[PDB]
Coordinates of C-alpha atoms (C1' of nucleotides) and ligand atoms in Angstrom, one line a residue:
Chain A
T1 CA 95.5 -68.8 97.2
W2 CA 93.1 -71.6 96.1
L3 CA 95.3 -71.9 93.0
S4 CA 98.5 -72.6 95.0
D5 CA 97.0 -74.9 97.7
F6 CA 95.7 -77.3 95.1
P7 CA 98.2 -77.5 92.1
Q8 CA 96.9 -80.9 91.0
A9 CA 93.2 -80.0 90.9
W10 CA 93.4 -77.0 88.4
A11 CA 93.7 -77.6 84.7
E12 CA 96.1 -74.7 84.6
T13 CA 98.6 -76.4 86.9
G14 CA 98.0 -80.1 87.0
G15 CA 98.4 -81.2 83.4
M16 CA 95.8 -83.1 81.4
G17 CA 93.4 -85.3 83.4
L18 CA 93.0 -89.1 83.5
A19 CA 90.5 -90.8 85.7
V20 CA 92.8 -93.4 87.1
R21 CA 90.1 -95.2 89.1
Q22 CA 87.9 -95.7 86.1
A23 CA 88.3 -98.8 83.9
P24 CA 88.7 -98.2 80.2
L25 CA 85.3 -98.0 78.7
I26 CA 84.0 -100.7 76.3
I27 CA 81.3 -99.4 73.9
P28 CA 78.7 -102.1 73.0
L29 CA 77.3 -102.1 69.5
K30 CA 73.8 -102.9 68.5
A31 CA 73.3 -106.6 67.6
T32 CA 73.2 -106.1 63.8
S33 CA 75.9 -103.4 63.5
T34 CA 78.7 -103.8 61.0
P35 CA 81.5 -101.2 60.6
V36 CA 80.9 -98.2 58.3
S37 CA 83.7 -96.4 56.5
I38 CA 82.6 -92.9 55.3
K39 CA 85.0 -91.1 53.0
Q40 CA 86.7 -87.9 54.2
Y41 CA 85.5 -84.9 52.2
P42 CA 88.6 -83.1 50.8
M43 CA 89.7 -80.5 53.3
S44 CA 91.1 -77.1 52.1
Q45 CA 94.6 -76.2 53.1
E46 CA 93.3 -73.4 55.3
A47 CA 91.1 -75.8 57.3
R48 CA 93.9 -78.3 57.5
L49 CA 96.4 -75.6 58.8
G50 CA 93.9 -74.5 61.4
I51 CA 93.2 -78.0 62.6
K52 CA 96.8 -79.2 62.5
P53 CA 98.1 -77.8 65.8
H54 CA 95.2 -79.4 67.7
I55 CA 95.8 -82.8 66.2
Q56 CA 99.5 -82.6 67.0
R57 CA 98.7 -81.5 70.6
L58 CA 96.4 -84.5 71.0
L59 CA 98.9 -86.9 69.5
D60 CA 101.5 -85.6 71.9
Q61 CA 99.1 -86.1 74.8
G62 CA 98.4 -89.7 73.6
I63 CA 94.8 -88.8 73.3
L64 CA 95.0 -89.6 69.6
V65 CA 96.9 -92.5 68.2
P66 CA 97.6 -93.8 64.7
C67 CA 95.5 -96.9 63.6
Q68 CA 94.0 -98.9 60.8
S69 CA 90.3 -99.4 61.2
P70 CA 87.3 -100.6 59.2
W71 CA 85.4 -97.7 60.7
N72 CA 85.8 -94.1 59.5
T73 CA 83.8 -90.9 59.9
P74 CA 84.4 -87.4 58.5
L75 CA 86.2 -84.5 60.1
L76 CA 84.7 -81.1 59.6
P77 CA 86.2 -77.6 58.8
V78 CA 84.4 -76.1 61.7
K79 CA 84.9 -72.6 63.3
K80 CA 82.7 -69.8 64.5
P81 CA 83.5 -66.1 63.7
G82 CA 85.0 -66.1 60.2
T83 CA 87.9 -68.5 59.7
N84 CA 89.5 -68.9 63.1
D85 CA 89.5 -71.4 65.9
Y86 CA 89.6 -74.5 63.7
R87 CA 89.0 -77.1 66.4
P88 CA 88.4 -80.5 64.8
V89 CA 84.8 -81.6 64.7
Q90 CA 84.0 -85.2 64.0
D91 CA 80.6 -86.2 62.5
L92 CA 79.9 -89.4 64.6
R93 CA 76.3 -89.8 63.5
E94 CA 76.8 -93.0 61.6
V95 CA 78.7 -94.4 64.5
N96 CA 76.1 -93.3 67.0
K97 CA 73.4 -95.1 65.0
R98 CA 75.2 -98.4 65.4
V99 CA 76.0 -98.1 69.1
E100 CA 73.6 -99.7 71.6
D101 CA 71.4 -97.2 73.5
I102 CA 71.8 -96.6 77.2
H103 CA 69.3 -95.1 79.7
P104 CA 69.6 -91.3 79.9
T105 CA 70.6 -90.9 83.6
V106 CA 71.7 -87.3 83.5
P107 CA 68.8 -85.3 85.2
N108 CA 67.6 -82.2 83.5
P109 CA 68.8 -78.9 85.1
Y110 CA 65.4 -78.0 86.5
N111 CA 65.0 -81.3 88.5
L112 CA 68.7 -81.3 89.5
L113 CA 68.3 -77.8 91.1
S114 CA 65.2 -78.9 93.0
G115 CA 67.6 -80.7 95.3
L116 CA 69.1 -77.4 96.5
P117 CA 67.8 -76.6 100.1
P118 CA 67.3 -73.0 101.3
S119 CA 69.4 -74.0 104.3
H120 CA 72.5 -74.0 102.1
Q121 CA 73.3 -70.6 100.7
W122 CA 77.1 -70.7 100.3
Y123 CA 78.0 -72.0 96.9
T124 CA 81.1 -73.1 95.0
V125 CA 80.8 -73.9 91.3
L126 CA 83.4 -75.7 89.3
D127 CA 83.4 -77.0 85.7
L128 CA 85.8 -79.8 84.8
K129 CA 88.1 -79.1 81.8
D130 CA 88.3 -81.7 79.0
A131 CA 86.1 -84.0 81.1
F132 CA 85.4 -86.6 78.5
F133 CA 89.1 -86.9 77.7
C134 CA 89.7 -87.9 81.3
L135 CA 87.9 -91.3 80.6
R136 CA 89.9 -93.9 78.9
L137 CA 88.5 -95.9 76.0
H138 CA 89.2 -99.7 76.0
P139 CA 91.5 -100.6 73.1
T140 CA 88.7 -102.8 71.7
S141 CA 86.4 -99.9 71.3
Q142 CA 89.0 -97.4 70.1
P143 CA 88.8 -98.4 66.3
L144 CA 85.1 -97.3 66.3
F145 CA 86.0 -93.6 66.3
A146 CA 88.7 -93.5 63.6
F147 CA 89.0 -90.7 61.1
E148 CA 91.4 -89.8 58.3
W149 CA 94.3 -87.4 58.7
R150 CA 96.7 -86.5 55.9
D151 CA 99.6 -84.1 55.7
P152 CA 100.3 -83.5 51.9
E153 CA 103.9 -82.7 53.0
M154 CA 104.4 -86.3 54.2
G155 CA 102.8 -86.3 57.6
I156 CA 100.7 -89.2 58.8
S157 CA 100.0 -92.6 57.1
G158 CA 96.2 -92.5 57.3
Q159 CA 93.8 -92.9 60.2
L160 CA 94.0 -91.7 63.8
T161 CA 91.6 -92.6 66.6
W162 CA 90.7 -91.6 70.2
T163 CA 92.0 -93.4 73.3
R164 CA 89.6 -91.3 75.4
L165 CA 85.9 -90.8 75.4
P166 CA 85.3 -88.5 72.3
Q167 CA 83.3 -85.4 71.7
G168 CA 80.3 -86.0 69.4
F169 CA 79.6 -89.5 70.7
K170 CA 76.0 -89.8 71.8
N171 CA 76.8 -91.6 75.1
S172 CA 79.7 -89.4 76.3
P173 CA 77.7 -87.1 78.5
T174 CA 75.9 -89.9 80.3
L175 CA 78.9 -92.1 80.6
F176 CA 80.9 -89.3 82.1
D177 CA 78.2 -88.3 84.6
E178 CA 77.9 -92.0 85.8
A179 CA 81.6 -92.2 86.1
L180 CA 82.5 -89.3 88.5
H181 CA 79.3 -90.1 90.3
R182 CA 81.1 -93.4 91.1
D183 CA 84.3 -91.5 91.8
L184 CA 82.6 -89.0 94.1
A185 CA 80.4 -91.4 96.1
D186 CA 82.9 -91.5 98.9
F187 CA 83.2 -87.7 99.1
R188 CA 79.4 -87.4 99.5
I189 CA 79.7 -90.1 102.2
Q190 CA 82.5 -88.2 104.0
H191 CA 80.6 -84.9 103.8
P192 CA 76.9 -85.6 104.8
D193 CA 76.2 -81.9 105.6
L194 CA 77.2 -80.8 102.1
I195 CA 75.0 -80.7 99.0
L196 CA 76.8 -81.7 95.7
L197 CA 74.9 -81.3 92.4
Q198 CA 76.5 -82.9 89.3
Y199 CA 75.6 -82.1 85.7
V200 CA 78.1 -83.9 83.6
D201 CA 81.1 -81.6 84.0
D202 CA 79.4 -78.8 85.9
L203 CA 79.5 -79.0 89.7
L204 CA 77.8 -77.1 92.4
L205 CA 78.8 -77.5 96.1
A206 CA 76.4 -76.0 98.6
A207 CA 77.1 -75.4 102.3
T208 CA 75.3 -73.7 105.3
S209 CA 78.2 -71.5 106.3
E210 CA 81.2 -69.8 104.5
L211 CA 83.5 -71.9 106.6
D212 CA 81.9 -75.2 105.7
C213 CA 81.9 -74.2 102.1
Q214 CA 85.6 -73.4 102.4
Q215 CA 86.5 -76.6 104.0
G216 CA 84.2 -78.5 101.6
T217 CA 85.7 -76.9 98.6
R218 CA 89.2 -77.7 99.8
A219 CA 88.2 -81.3 100.2
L220 CA 86.5 -81.5 96.8
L221 CA 89.4 -80.0 94.9
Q222 CA 91.8 -82.3 96.7
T223 CA 89.6 -85.3 95.8
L224 CA 89.1 -84.3 92.2
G225 CA 92.8 -83.7 91.8
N226 CA 93.7 -87.1 93.2
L227 CA 91.2 -88.9 91.1
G228 CA 92.6 -87.3 87.9
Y229 CA 90.0 -84.7 87.0
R230 CA 90.9 -81.1 86.4
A231 CA 88.8 -78.0 87.2
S232 CA 89.1 -74.6 85.4
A233 CA 90.7 -72.2 87.8
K234 CA 89.8 -69.3 85.5
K235 CA 86.0 -69.9 85.7
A236 CA 85.9 -71.1 89.3
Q237 CA 83.4 -69.4 91.5
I238 CA 84.5 -70.1 95.1
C239 CA 82.4 -69.7 98.3
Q240 CA 80.2 -67.0 96.9
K241 CA 76.6 -66.3 98.0
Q242 CA 75.8 -65.6 94.4
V243 CA 76.9 -67.9 91.5
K244 CA 76.0 -68.7 87.9
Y245 CA 75.2 -72.4 87.5
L246 CA 73.6 -74.1 84.5
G247 CA 72.3 -70.9 83.1
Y248 CA 70.7 -69.8 86.4
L249 CA 71.9 -67.2 88.8
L250 CA 71.6 -68.6 92.3
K251 CA 70.9 -65.8 94.7
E252 CA 69.0 -65.2 97.9
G253 CA 67.9 -68.9 97.6
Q254 CA 66.2 -68.1 94.3
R255 CA 66.1 -70.2 91.1
Chain B
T1 CA 2.8 -94.3 29.3
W2 CA 3.9 -92.9 32.6
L3 CA 4.6 -89.7 30.6
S4 CA 1.0 -89.4 29.3
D5 CA -0.8 -90.4 32.5
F6 CA 0.8 -87.6 34.5
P7 CA 1.3 -84.5 32.2
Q8 CA 1.5 -82.2 35.2
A9 CA 4.2 -84.1 37.1
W10 CA 6.9 -84.2 34.5
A11 CA 9.1 -81.1 33.9
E12 CA 9.0 -81.9 30.2
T13 CA 5.2 -81.5 30.1
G14 CA 4.0 -79.5 33.1
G15 CA 5.8 -76.2 32.8
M16 CA 8.0 -74.6 35.5
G17 CA 7.2 -75.6 39.0
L18 CA 5.9 -73.5 41.9
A19 CA 5.2 -75.0 45.4
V20 CA 1.7 -73.4 45.8
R21 CA 1.3 -74.7 49.3
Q22 CA 4.5 -73.2 50.6
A23 CA 4.5 -69.7 52.0
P24 CA 7.1 -67.4 50.5
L25 CA 10.4 -67.8 52.4
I26 CA 11.7 -65.1 54.7
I27 CA 15.5 -65.2 55.2
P28 CA 16.6 -64.0 58.7
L29 CA 19.9 -62.1 58.9
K30 CA 22.4 -62.3 61.7
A31 CA 21.8 -59.7 64.4
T32 CA 24.7 -57.4 63.3
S33 CA 24.4 -57.9 59.5
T34 CA 24.3 -54.8 57.3
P35 CA 24.0 -55.0 53.5
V36 CA 27.1 -55.5 51.4
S37 CA 27.5 -54.3 47.8
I38 CA 30.3 -56.0 45.9
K39 CA 31.1 -54.6 42.5
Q40 CA 30.6 -56.8 39.4
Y41 CA 33.9 -57.6 37.7
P42 CA 33.7 -56.6 34.0
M43 CA 32.4 -59.5 32.0
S44 CA 33.7 -60.1 28.5
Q45 CA 31.2 -60.0 25.6
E46 CA 31.6 -63.8 25.1
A47 CA 30.6 -64.6 28.7
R48 CA 27.8 -62.1 28.5
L49 CA 26.5 -63.6 25.2
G50 CA 26.6 -67.0 26.8
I51 CA 24.7 -66.0 29.9
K52 CA 22.2 -63.7 28.1
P53 CA 19.7 -66.4 27.0
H54 CA 19.4 -67.8 30.5
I55 CA 18.8 -64.4 32.1
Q56 CA 16.0 -63.7 29.5
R57 CA 14.4 -67.1 30.1
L58 CA 14.4 -66.5 33.8
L59 CA 13.0 -63.0 33.4
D60 CA 10.3 -64.4 31.2
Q61 CA 9.5 -67.0 33.8
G62 CA 9.3 -64.3 36.5
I63 CA 12.0 -66.1 38.4
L64 CA 14.2 -63.0 38.0
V65 CA 12.9 -59.4 38.3
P66 CA 14.4 -56.0 38.1
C67 CA 15.2 -54.2 41.3
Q68 CA 17.3 -51.6 43.2
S69 CA 19.0 -53.1 46.2
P70 CA 21.7 -52.1 48.7
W71 CA 22.9 -55.7 48.3
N72 CA 24.9 -56.9 45.4
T73 CA 27.1 -59.9 44.7
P74 CA 29.1 -60.9 41.6
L75 CA 28.1 -63.0 38.6
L76 CA 30.7 -65.4 37.3
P77 CA 31.7 -66.4 33.7
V78 CA 31.3 -70.1 34.5
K79 CA 31.3 -73.0 32.1
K80 CA 32.9 -76.5 32.0
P81 CA 34.4 -77.9 28.8
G82 CA 36.0 -74.9 26.9
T83 CA 33.7 -71.9 26.5
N84 CA 30.2 -73.4 26.3
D85 CA 27.2 -73.8 28.6
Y86 CA 27.5 -70.3 30.2
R87 CA 24.9 -70.8 33.0
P88 CA 25.1 -67.8 35.3
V89 CA 26.8 -68.6 38.6
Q90 CA 26.4 -66.2 41.5
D91 CA 29.0 -65.8 44.3
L92 CA 26.8 -65.6 47.3
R93 CA 29.5 -66.1 49.9
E94 CA 29.3 -62.5 51.4
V95 CA 25.6 -62.9 51.6
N96 CA 25.8 -66.4 53.2
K97 CA 28.1 -65.0 55.9
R98 CA 25.5 -62.5 56.9
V99 CA 22.5 -64.9 57.0
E100 CA 21.6 -66.5 60.3
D101 CA 22.6 -70.2 60.5
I102 CA 20.0 -73.0 60.6
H103 CA 20.3 -76.5 61.9
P104 CA 21.4 -79.0 59.1
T105 CA 18.4 -81.3 58.9
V106 CA 19.3 -83.1 55.7
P107 CA 20.6 -86.6 56.7
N108 CA 23.7 -87.8 55.0
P109 CA 23.2 -90.4 52.3
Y110 CA 24.6 -93.3 54.4
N111 CA 22.1 -92.8 57.2
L112 CA 19.2 -92.1 54.9
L113 CA 19.7 -95.4 53.1
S114 CA 19.9 -97.3 56.4
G115 CA 16.1 -96.8 56.5
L116 CA 15.7 -99.1 53.4
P117 CA 14.2 -102.5 54.6
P118 CA 15.1 -105.7 52.7
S119 CA 11.4 -106.3 52.5
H120 CA 11.0 -103.6 49.9
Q121 CA 12.9 -104.4 46.8
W122 CA 10.9 -102.6 44.1
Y123 CA 12.2 -99.1 43.6
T124 CA 11.3 -95.9 41.8
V125 CA 13.7 -93.0 41.8
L126 CA 12.8 -89.5 40.8
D127 CA 14.8 -86.3 40.9
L128 CA 12.9 -83.0 40.9
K129 CA 13.9 -80.4 38.2
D130 CA 14.8 -76.9 39.3
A131 CA 13.7 -77.8 42.8
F132 CA 14.9 -74.6 44.5
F133 CA 13.1 -72.4 41.9
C134 CA 9.8 -74.0 43.0
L135 CA 10.0 -72.3 46.4
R136 CA 9.0 -68.6 46.5
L137 CA 11.1 -66.0 48.2
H138 CA 9.2 -63.4 50.3
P139 CA 9.5 -59.9 48.8
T140 CA 11.3 -58.7 51.9
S141 CA 14.1 -61.2 51.4
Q142 CA 14.4 -60.8 47.6
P143 CA 16.7 -57.7 47.6
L144 CA 19.3 -59.8 49.5
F145 CA 20.2 -61.8 46.3
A146 CA 20.6 -58.9 43.8
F147 CA 23.3 -58.8 41.2
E148 CA 24.2 -56.5 38.3
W149 CA 23.1 -57.1 34.7
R150 CA 24.0 -54.8 31.8
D151 CA 23.3 -55.0 28.1
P152 CA 25.8 -52.5 26.3
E153 CA 23.2 -52.3 23.5
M154 CA 20.6 -50.7 25.9
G155 CA 19.2 -53.7 27.8
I156 CA 18.5 -53.6 31.5
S157 CA 18.8 -50.6 33.9
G158 CA 20.9 -52.3 36.5
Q159 CA 20.2 -54.9 39.1
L160 CA 18.0 -58.1 38.9
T161 CA 17.2 -60.4 41.8
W162 CA 15.5 -63.8 42.5
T163 CA 11.8 -64.3 43.5
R164 CA 12.7 -67.9 44.1
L165 CA 15.1 -69.8 46.4
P166 CA 18.5 -69.3 44.6
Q167 CA 21.4 -71.5 43.8
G168 CA 24.5 -70.8 45.8
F169 CA 22.6 -69.8 48.9
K170 CA 23.9 -71.8 51.9
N171 CA 20.4 -72.7 53.2
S172 CA 18.7 -73.6 50.0
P173 CA 19.2 -77.4 50.2
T174 CA 18.0 -77.6 53.8
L175 CA 15.1 -75.3 53.3
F176 CA 14.0 -77.2 50.2
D177 CA 14.3 -80.6 52.1
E178 CA 12.2 -79.3 55.0
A179 CA 9.6 -77.9 52.6
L180 CA 8.6 -80.9 50.5
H181 CA 8.9 -83.0 53.7
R182 CA 6.0 -80.8 54.8
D183 CA 4.2 -81.2 51.5
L184 CA 4.7 -85.0 51.4
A185 CA 3.7 -85.7 55.0
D186 CA 0.1 -86.6 53.9
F187 CA 1.4 -88.9 51.2
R188 CA 3.4 -90.8 53.7
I189 CA 0.3 -91.0 55.9
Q190 CA -1.8 -92.3 53.0
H191 CA 0.7 -94.9 52.1
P192 CA 2.0 -96.6 55.3
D193 CA 3.3 -99.6 53.5
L194 CA 5.6 -97.6 51.3
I195 CA 9.1 -96.4 52.0
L196 CA 9.9 -92.9 50.8
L197 CA 13.5 -91.5 51.2
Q198 CA 14.1 -87.9 50.5
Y199 CA 17.5 -86.2 49.9
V200 CA 16.7 -82.7 48.9
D201 CA 15.6 -83.1 45.2
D202 CA 16.3 -86.9 45.0
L203 CA 13.5 -89.2 45.8
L204 CA 13.4 -93.0 46.3
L205 CA 10.1 -94.8 46.7
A206 CA 10.4 -98.5 47.8
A207 CA 7.6 -101.1 47.7
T208 CA 7.3 -104.8 48.5
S209 CA 5.7 -105.7 45.1
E210 CA 5.8 -104.4 41.5
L211 CA 2.1 -103.6 41.7
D212 CA 2.4 -101.6 45.0
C213 CA 5.4 -99.7 43.4
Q214 CA 3.3 -99.0 40.4
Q215 CA 0.3 -97.8 42.4
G216 CA 2.6 -95.9 44.7
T217 CA 4.5 -94.2 41.9
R218 CA 1.2 -93.2 40.3
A219 CA 0.1 -91.6 43.5
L220 CA 3.5 -89.9 44.2
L221 CA 3.6 -88.4 40.7
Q222 CA 0.0 -87.2 41.0
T223 CA 0.8 -85.6 44.4
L224 CA 4.0 -84.0 43.2
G225 CA 2.3 -82.6 40.2
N226 CA -0.6 -81.1 42.2
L227 CA 1.7 -79.6 44.7
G228 CA 3.7 -77.8 42.0
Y229 CA 6.9 -79.8 41.8
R230 CA 8.3 -81.3 38.6
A231 CA 10.2 -84.5 38.1
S232 CA 12.6 -85.3 35.2
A233 CA 10.9 -87.8 32.9
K234 CA 14.2 -88.4 31.1
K235 CA 16.0 -89.6 34.2
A236 CA 13.1 -91.3 35.9
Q237 CA 13.7 -94.9 37.0
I238 CA 10.3 -96.5 37.4
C239 CA 9.5 -99.7 39.2
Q240 CA 12.9 -101.3 38.7
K241 CA 14.5 -103.9 40.9
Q242 CA 17.8 -102.2 40.2
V243 CA 18.2 -98.4 40.4
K244 CA 21.0 -95.8 40.9
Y245 CA 20.3 -93.6 43.9
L246 CA 22.6 -91.1 45.5
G247 CA 25.7 -92.6 43.9
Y248 CA 24.8 -96.1 45.0
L249 CA 23.4 -99.0 42.9
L250 CA 20.6 -100.6 44.8
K251 CA 20.4 -104.3 43.9
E252 CA 19.5 -107.5 45.5
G253 CA 18.9 -105.5 48.7
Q254 CA 22.6 -104.4 48.7
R255 CA 24.0 -101.0 49.4
Chain C
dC1 C1' 37.1 -63.5 39.2
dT2 C1' 37.7 -64.2 44.4
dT3 C1' 38.8 -66.8 48.3
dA4 C1' 39.7 -70.6 51.7
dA5 C1' 42.2 -74.9 51.8
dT6 C1' 45.7 -78.3 50.5
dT7 C1' 50.3 -79.5 48.5
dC8 C1' 54.8 -79.5 47.6
Chain D
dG1 C1' 55.5 -69.2 50.2
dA2 C1' 54.4 -70.1 45.4
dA3 C1' 51.4 -73.8 42.8
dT4 C1' 47.3 -76.3 42.7
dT5 C1' 42.4 -77.3 44.0
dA6 C1' 37.8 -76.6 45.0
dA7 C1' 33.8 -73.9 45.0
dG8 C1' 30.4 -69.6 45.1
Chain E
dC1 C1' 80.3 -81.0 54.2
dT2 C1' 76.0 -83.9 55.4
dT3 C1' 71.6 -84.6 57.3
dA4 C1' 67.2 -84.2 59.9
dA5 C1' 63.9 -80.6 61.1
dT6 C1' 61.4 -76.3 60.7
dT7 C1' 59.5 -72.4 57.9
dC8 C1' 57.5 -70.0 54.5
Chain F
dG1 C1' 59.4 -77.8 47.6
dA2 C1' 63.0 -74.3 47.9
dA3 C1' 65.2 -71.5 52.0
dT4 C1' 66.8 -71.5 56.6
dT5 C1' 68.3 -73.8 61.0
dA6 C1' 70.6 -76.7 63.9
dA7 C1' 74.1 -80.0 64.9
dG8 C1' 77.7 -84.0 64.3
Ligands
LIG301 N1 53.9 -76.4 44.2 C1 53.5 -77.4 43.4 N2 54.2 -77.7 42.3 C2 52.2 -78.2 43.8 C3 51.3 -77.7 44.8 C4 50.0 -78.4 45.2 C5 49.6 -79.7 44.6 O1 48.4 -80.5 44.9 C6 47.0 -80.2 45.6 C7 46.5 -78.8 45.8 C8 45.2 -78.5 46.4 C9 44.3 -79.6 46.8 C10 42.9 -79.2 47.5 N3 42.5 -77.9 47.6 C11 41.3 -77.9 48.2 C12 40.4 -76.7 48.5 C13 39.1 -76.8 49.2 C14 38.2 -75.6 49.5 N4 38.4 -74.8 50.6 N5 37.2 -75.3 48.7 C15 38.6 -78.3 49.5 C16 39.5 -79.5 49.1 C17 40.9 -79.3 48.4 N6 41.9 -80.1 48.0 C18 44.7 -81.1 46.7 C19 46.1 -81.3 46.0 C20 50.6 -80.3 43.5 C21 51.9 -79.6 43.1
LIG302 N1 61.6 -69.9 52.3 C1 62.0 -68.9 53.1 N2 62.3 -67.7 52.6 C2 62.2 -69.1 54.7 C3 62.3 -70.5 55.2 C4 62.5 -70.9 56.6 C5 62.6 -69.8 57.7 O1 62.8 -70.1 59.1 C6 63.3 -71.2 60.0 C7 64.1 -72.4 59.5 C8 64.5 -73.5 60.4 C9 64.3 -73.5 61.8 C10 64.8 -74.8 62.7 N3 65.5 -75.8 62.1 C11 65.8 -76.7 63.0 C12 66.6 -78.0 62.8 C13 66.9 -78.9 64.1 C14 67.6 -80.2 63.9 N4 67.0 -81.3 63.4 N5 68.9 -80.3 64.2 C15 66.4 -78.4 65.5 C16 65.6 -77.0 65.6 C17 65.4 -76.2 64.3 N6 64.7 -74.9 64.0 C18 63.6 -72.3 62.5 C19 63.1 -71.2 61.5 C20 62.6 -68.3 57.2 C21 62.4 -68.0 55.7

DNA sequence: CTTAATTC
DNA sequence: GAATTAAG
DNA sequence: CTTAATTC
DNA sequence: GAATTAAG
């Protein structure tokens, strides 16, 4: 009943996340950067109809808000199979080129796993849902990610932008990893005998016994829920001696 | 009257050369080499008519002789401007690949000229005509360079081959340089105060005074003539303080 | 005429 | 990978 | 739809 | 240099 014991921690039962302890992020631009406004390539009705539901959902969630900005980047008619799942994909390359670089602090999977001791063979893997959207963007940095949205049948005035850390932004993974690391520092301190590996939104908790893993997982879920993050209950691998993490299969202390 | 004083040394007055002091060359094959017989691509009448005179001249000079050989390489319809000067060009690449490698002892022009002292500013440049043809090929190595020659109007049976070091053979330049160096060793010994640079068939004699250059050039021409080599009287640059050698212009001690 | 390398 | 060179 | 890289 | 990839 992991699902029922922690209603707030699961994305399926706790509503959209919001890292309440994290201050809205301010995105520094390179010293010579000036806003760039790239025109939106005309989108076909089919692509527009596919994307529409997502845009409305995000507007309802307050993740997207109307705005007028000197910045503008293109939205793409992206999918995968044939012409389904039209999730909106923003081409933020011209924005990324004007944003100041930050040190890449997210360790590569290989080195991250090196920190997994043979002594801890009871694992719990969790992946946070819509992780980036949990981090607020400071109002001053919001205009930077604006894009155009039109509804030929009288819909929206013009531009919309993100109030949360967006997908496609070059520093989103790193900024999210650093945050969360900050939010989970106390948990690590409260559970010295537990191993916690973090790779952006993918978490691995390792314990020496099934009990400790159970007690540790309870604590982690409780903490994540309270902080405003949400884990996928569907994909959760709880207290297993064999789990799939970052492309590896952890078994018998191997990999 | 350099031309009249040394009839035997100039190609224009001494007949074809023949290095009488040099033993016929034997060309060692790689340890696993076996003869290769490449078919002659059909040659058009125009190409055949252009090449014909050269082949006959060489046969008359004994430089080319009939033969039957398990080796055979192609003759090419080579020219330059449009369809003139049809000098025979043999593709000896499959023969070169089967001949044992030798150390490249011919110095590059740059290093060779480094041996030209500022003290010697009176130059004489000579280039030997048909240098390679002056070196005899041992009968045992002759079959290696065979090619096909036909005269639709009943001319030659089949193959012809060289009795002299041929053009297109990978070791001809080096073998010629080494020979000649051997033939001119005494001259260097008899003229210690003279500088003699050799680059295959291109010679540069350098002296400190116009007189020494005159006396030295006389001696060199006499020696070359007696040994069986022939210098181009037309291109000869005699006792000049400015001469063109190996692409460089030697002047005021420069280059 | 082939063939090995260099460009685009 | 189809032109373009360079060279025997 | 772009755009930067990789192949052939 | 024209395809083919990969990715925002
Ligand atoms: N596809 C196209 N339109 C074009 C393709 C190629 C182009 O240029 C060039 C093609 C070939 C060379 C070039 N080729 C060689 C071959 C050499 C050898 N191995 N003998 C030795 C040196 C050398 N230089 C130099 C430049 C220009 C245009
Ligand atoms: N001319 C032709 N018929 C062909 C041309 C190209 C062919 O293959 C390939 C083409 C392109 C790739 C390839 N392209 C990329 C682009 C990358 C990027 N910068 N996002 C990152 C990694 C990557 N791999 C790999 C193989 C096959 C056939």
